[PDB]
Write a protein that binds this ligand. Sequence first.
Ligand SMILES: [Mn+2]
Ligand SMILES: [Mn+2]
Length: 194
Amino acid sequence: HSVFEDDLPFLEFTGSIVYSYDASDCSFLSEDISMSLSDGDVVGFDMEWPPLYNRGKLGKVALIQLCVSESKCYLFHVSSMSVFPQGLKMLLENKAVKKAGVGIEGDQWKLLRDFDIKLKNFVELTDVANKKLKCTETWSLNSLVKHLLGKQLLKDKSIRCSNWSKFPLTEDQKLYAATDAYAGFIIYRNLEIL
Ligand SMILES: [Mn+2]
Ligand SMILES: [Mn+2]
């Protein structure tokens, strides 16, 4: 196999991972996020859900990740919250904050479906790359991490495709879920060249 085929080092977030599994708590964290951002700021977005199917569809969303800086990532374990955090809902529906990721359009659908939350102001990284990188490629979060950071995403399937609704999350789940948002945040920020 070629050099381009080589196994690159793993992308692993090493900053602050804030784990929240209580509604009230979550709403206040969301306000913290909002106090630390300004209109037009982009955060890394992503979500996880259990593997078992529910009445014909994928398991209901259980976790939401938001990387707001190169050193802080939020893990909102909504599946463990009695009611969906009102502060998070306003954050995800606030077009003042932009959400970046790969396959977000799909996340929007599932989000509206599982929680009736309307995700506002999101960018499909695939398009941001093709635009700023002056190309016309088919991307995945992983292929973007590789091409731009010289790294690949953690891939233990037993982790990534694990029961995200199971409380509490394990350090590995937290790391995985957290790094995806981070990659979303870093990849967007790095594509701002001209
Ligand atoms: Mn995802
Ligand atoms: Mn993910």
